[PDB]
Amino acid sequence: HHVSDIPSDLHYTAEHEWIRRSGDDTVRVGITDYAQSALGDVVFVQLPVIGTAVTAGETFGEVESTKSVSDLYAPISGKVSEVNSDLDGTPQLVNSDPYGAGWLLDIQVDSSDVAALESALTTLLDAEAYRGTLTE
């Protein structure tokens, strides 16, 4: 049994997404090591369109192995500002590198339209709290 990687520098949701603050107004989002391992080899990733306004907790996609499908949720409100085009051809990046090249999308927040990031991040789990949720 491998112990799943949970980078200390990320935030998480209980539903096994990670959130990296990539800029003042941007988070990058993927699924955790635990999630990718549980799902199985990702054969498909449905991500939302760049520009899509998302609200926290909203289903905006799905990640799919041959055995399993899992909804992807917006961990924060904002707008999808990037999606990882690599996953079209190489979806198993999610499995091989869940926190790196396997990232799914970015959500950009404007303070104006949605919660400032500082605040948005307060709904999210830290690495330790995420680990705490896991039955691994």
Curated annotation (Swiss-Prot):
Domain of life: Bacteria
One of the GO biological process terms: glycine decarboxylation via glycine cleavage system
This protein's encoding gene: gcvH
Note on cofactor: Binds 1 lipoyl cofactor covalently.
Family per record: Belongs to the GcvH family.
Protein name listed in UniProt: Glycine cleavage system H protein
NCBIfam families, per the entry: gcvH, PRK01202.1
Primary role: The glycine cleavage system catalyzes the degradation of glycine. The H protein shuttles the methylamine group of glycine from the P protein to the T protein.
Residues with the N6-lipoyllysine modification: 67
Phylogenetic lineage: Bacteria, Bacillati, Actinomycetota, Actinomycetes, Mycobacteriales
Cofactor: (R)-lipoate
SUPFAM superfamilies attached to this UniProt entry: Single hybrid motif (SSF51230)
Subunit structure: The glycine cleavage system is composed of four proteins: P, T, L and H.
Domain Lipoyl-binding as annotated: residue spans: 26-108
